[PDB]
Design a protein around this ligand. Structure first.
Ligand SMILES: *[C@@H]1O[C@H](CO[C@@H]2O[C@@H](C)[C@@H](O)[C@@H](O)[C@@H]2O)[C@@H](O[C@@H]2O[C@H](CO)[C@@H](O[C@@H]3O[C@H](CO)[C@@H](O)[C@H](O[C@H]4O[C@H](CO)[C@@H](O)[C@H](O)[C@@H]4O)[C@@H]3O)[C@H](O)[C@H]2NC(C)=O)[C@H](O)[C@H]1NC(C)=O
Ligand SMILES: NCCCC[C@H](NC(=O)[C@@H](S)Cc1ccccc1)C(=O)N[C@@H](Cc1c[nH]c2ccccc12)C(=O)O
Ligand SMILES: *[C@@H]1O[C@H](CO)[C@@H](O)[C@H](O)[C@H]1NC(C)=O
Ligand SMILES: [Cl-]
Ligand SMILES: [Cl-]
Ligand SMILES: [Zn+2]
Length: 578
């Protein structure tokens, strides 16, 4: 009966608001103050939320969704039939929650120590070494040390984690946890769709890779860079070689068109983490989107605490499931990279505020990639010379073709370099979850994919005992990654569409949507849908068509593709590696 199903959804929504708000508070208190006591309370709230999930999920499974006529009620009930970890028997649920907490804690408190010297944390210390050192051996120490201290320490937990998350997935009707995660996109063609998008980005990536490889050969020396091989993974300015923009100074296309030191400008002008988030809030409200509430400024953790607390530094945005309390937790450093991250996080908050009035089961992005994309769209405009000049962080550039290619290169070092990384993380994990990669070859298969997709090699041979995926936050934290690949494709589709909505003409990369109410209205209409409809509808509302497409990203970077081809041809580069 339709009436029992409607009553059930109302009861689930009321009770879920209460329980999820309590869980979120305990999880926040642990993430912002890692102690034995906050850990104990969080594990207890894990059992409370599981009790609720089991009670309502068991009832949801007694409905035959095929006979429900209302499509919204049918959709909610179907989703509530997935108990996630609460499907596990009690003993295994306890073990799984403990493993998750132990992995997170281990990653978050790991340090790398000089002999009878100082000990460095990942944020900010090791991140700063990778961004700024130009000495092969110093970069190697940080890169190898982080893997030795974080990655190795996760290995003891990972096989049992895999066993238990897969067991939960099978108890929810999937074949393994990777099947469960992929299902979040409601797109049976997902694997082939993503493969086609990756292939379309290959001209740009291969050309970028060859050009950067030549520049690294010039700086690090011919004995350390093979012009026909993969690039050593510690030289790209980033711990994971996932974004390459910190080595811009080594690869500047037109050195006769120098660009301001944006970190020094932000520091000399007294920028603080609060100013960075205030700028993001202003960009959203300039589009007619919602301001964050006063409570956000009182409750958020916008910088690393100075009082000794251990915290989870990795930037994240939090919905407390009461329609009022939204927060960001980020160990913000004052630089342009973290200004972009601040916009990324503020986009999550915007999404939370836009869909706050839907049933909690529908309070998610259209798919996980849409959630990750919103803030990045605005950050594309923040990063333009027009906007940066308005913040006093760049000198006016006028229209110089040299400054234009320089700008495109800076953007490509983040956006294009990340495409193969973001593709490969879950190619690896899906094969772990399906059993085709075992603990016998975790690390070998990781490196096989780092080579295949990114064209990188480890600077030191790996040994039994190494577990380099464990040194990347999302692995021990059990956060899916393909969302970030989807995000980087679709954020350019959204930029293109919002630029058109704002009446921009001329090259896509010159567009700045600051203050466009037309652009904001497109985004708001899609975000208000939350997860109520399959994601092609939201895609259609923003862009006027329903597919994911690399055409917008390719259009944005077309001038750079042309420049890179001419430059690599002049130097005789052989694209790719064996
Ligand atoms: C299938 O069922 C869904 C969900 O029903 C809702 O949840 C159930 C569990 C149960 O509690 C129901 O009683 C409950 O409605 C239906 O989707 C809802 O549809 C209604 C009617 O369209 C929407 O009501 C709207 O709510 C807005 C927020 O308060 C409000 O602004 C809207 O007013 C605006 O639009 C109206 C015209 O509709 C206009 O007169 C106003 O002046 C103003 O512009 C409006 O009242 C709910 O938001 C919907 N909820 C969800 C979650 O989608 C759905 O209609 C139903 N389908 C069928 C075919 O029956
Ligand atoms: N220095 C980067 C910090 C980015 C933090 C972001 N954070 C989440 O998405 C949180 S909101 C999700 C979460 C985390 C923990 C638990 C639950 C949910 C995140 O993870 N980006 C991915 C990809 C990425 C790298 N650079 C970026 C710059 C801008 C936008 C994205 C990226 C990553 O860092 O690899
Ligand atoms: C950190 O947690 C401990 C243990 O629960 C508690 O006593 C202390 O007040 C907490 N500090 C903060 C700043 O939340
Ligand atoms: Cl690695
Ligand atoms: Cl995902
Ligand atoms: Zn995010």
């Amino acid at each position: 009966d339709e009436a029992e199903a409607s009553k059930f959804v109302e009861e689930y929504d009321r009770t879920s608001q209460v329980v999820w708000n309590e869980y979120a508070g305990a999880n926040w208190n642990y993430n912002t103050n890692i102690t034995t006591e906050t850990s104990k309370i969080l594990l207890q709230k894990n059992m409370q939320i599981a009790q609720h999930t089991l009670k309502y999920g068991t009832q949801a499974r007694k409905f035959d969704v095929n006979q429900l006529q209302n499509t919204t009620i049918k959709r909610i009930i179907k989703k509530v039939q997935d108990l996630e970890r609460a499907a596990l028997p009690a003993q295994e649920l306890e073990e799984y929650n403990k493993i998750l907490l132990d992995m997170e804690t281990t990653y978050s408190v790991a340090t790398v120590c000089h002999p009878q010297g100082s000990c460095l944390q990942l944020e900010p210390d090791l991140t700063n070494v990778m961004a700024t050192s130009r000495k092969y051996e110093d970069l190697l120490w940080a890169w190898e040390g982080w893997r030795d201290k974080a990655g190795r320490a996760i290995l003891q937990f990972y096989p049992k984690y895999v066993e238990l998350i897969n067991q939960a997935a099978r108890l929810n009707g999937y074949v393994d946890a990777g099947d469960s995660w992929r299902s979040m996109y409601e797109t049976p063609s997902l694997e082939q769709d993503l493969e086609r998008l990756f292939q379309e980005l290959q001209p740009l990536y291969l050309n970028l890779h060859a050009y950067v490889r030549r520049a690294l050969h010039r700086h690090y020396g011919a004995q350390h860079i093979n012009l026909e091989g993969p690039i050593p993974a510690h030289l790209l300015g980033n711990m994971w070689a996932q974004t390459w923009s910190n080595i811009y100074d080594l690869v500047v296309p037109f050195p006769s068109a120098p660009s301001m030191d944006t970190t020094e400008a932000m520091l000399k002008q007294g920028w603080t983490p609060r100013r960075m988030f205030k700028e993001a809030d202003d960009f959203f409200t300039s589009l007619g989107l919602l301001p964050v509430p006063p409570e956000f400024w009182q409750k958020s953790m916008l910088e690393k605490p100075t009082d000794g607390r251990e915290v989870v530094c990795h930037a994240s945005a939090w919905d407390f499931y009461n329609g009022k309390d939204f927060r960001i937790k980020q160990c913000t450093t004052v630089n342009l990279e973290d200004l972009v991250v601040a916009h990324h996080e503020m986009g999550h908050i915007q999404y939370f505020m836009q869909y706050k009035d839907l049933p909690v089961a529908l309070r998610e992005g259209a798919n996980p990639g849409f959630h990750e994309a919103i803030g990045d769209v605005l950050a594309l405009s923040v990063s333009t010379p027009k906007h940066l000049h308005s913040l006093n962080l760049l000198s006016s550039e006028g229209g110089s073709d040299e400054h234009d290619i320089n700008f495109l290169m800076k953007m490509a070092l983040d956006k294009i370099a990340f495409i193969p990384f973001s593709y490969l993380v879950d190619q690896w994990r899906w094969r772990v979850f399906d059993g085709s990669i075992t603990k016998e070859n975790y690390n070998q298969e990781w490196w096989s994919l780092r080579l295949k997709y990114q064209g990188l090699c480890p600077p030191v041979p790996r040994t039994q005992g190494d577990f380099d995926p464990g040194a990347k936050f999302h692995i021990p934290s059990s956060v899916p990654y393909i969302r970030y690949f989807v995000s980087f494709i679709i954020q350019f589709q959204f930029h293109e569409a919002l630029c058109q909505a704002a009446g921009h003409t001329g090259p896509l990369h010159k567009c700045d949507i600051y203050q466009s109410k037309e652009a904001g209205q497109r985004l708001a209409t899609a975000m208000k849908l939350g997860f109520s409809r399959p994601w092609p509808e939201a895609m259609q509302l923003i862009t006027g068509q329903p597919q994911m497409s690399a055409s917008a990203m390719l259009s944005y970077f077309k001038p750079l593709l042309d420049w890179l081809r001419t430059e690599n041809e002049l130097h005789g580069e052989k694209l790719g590696w064996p």
